[PDB]
Amino acid sequence: QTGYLTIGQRYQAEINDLENLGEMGSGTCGQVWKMRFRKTGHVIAVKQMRRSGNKEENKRILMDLDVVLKSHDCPYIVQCFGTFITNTDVFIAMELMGTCAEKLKKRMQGPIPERILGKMTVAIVKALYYLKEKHGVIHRDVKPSNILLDERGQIKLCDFGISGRCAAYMAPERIDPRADVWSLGISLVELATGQFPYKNCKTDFEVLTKVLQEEPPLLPGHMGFSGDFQSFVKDCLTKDHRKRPKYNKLLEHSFIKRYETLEVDVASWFKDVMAK
């Protein structure tokens, strides 16, 4: 299905029906434009895959789109609104999110509150569990840059270009043969403290050295972090991949079950951080 913008209202449109409002971010999977649908006025994100582009980058863009299209019923994965195939380019209409957790960390200039990380943990775990269960997909790259938030308070994963069936969030069993949840724990410690636990390393291999040699970077106990938060991170940061719990066990954690029911005002916190 190409030439349709299903933003529950499907519009038979082309690429010329979108106004280019500038590029968002840089690099990563592909060139993402901020575009406005001239027919309705809605603003969406548009990935552009050039037919003449890098064959390795285009291979990841097509793999990401394959996962995104398969996940049209996962609330914690960015939805595709349609595609436009021309003789020169492929335009992938994605829903517009605010920013990634990495940029939230830089604009916050400090720790992100636990109540925000709780709603984020529930979203990312269910996203990874959805990719494993309904599709057999392993993310293989969970990082704050892959955790998007929006003005309404939604939290979703975005980049599946290297998934299958960066090195600083890599699990111990990936370096030396549930690896996606070690990356989630490293991301949680980073966002909960504002400091990356391996910022002292100067090379990629030195991070791999610290991951295997040093003890897991646990949460500090003097920042008011609840016991459920510290327990969930410790379970994620289990070095032996056999002792590390599966997704059906992590989804039953008290830290997960608490923020499934709790009402956290992520939307208001998001706009106040964006205004800083």
Ligand SMILES: *CCC(=O)N1CCC[C@@H](n2nc(I)c3c(N)ncnc32)C1
């Ligand atoms: C931290 C996020 C980031 O820098 N980045 C790279 C540039 C594109 C950006 N992004 N990718 C997608 I797919 C987006 C959607 N759907 N909305 C907003 N921004 C998006 C991710």
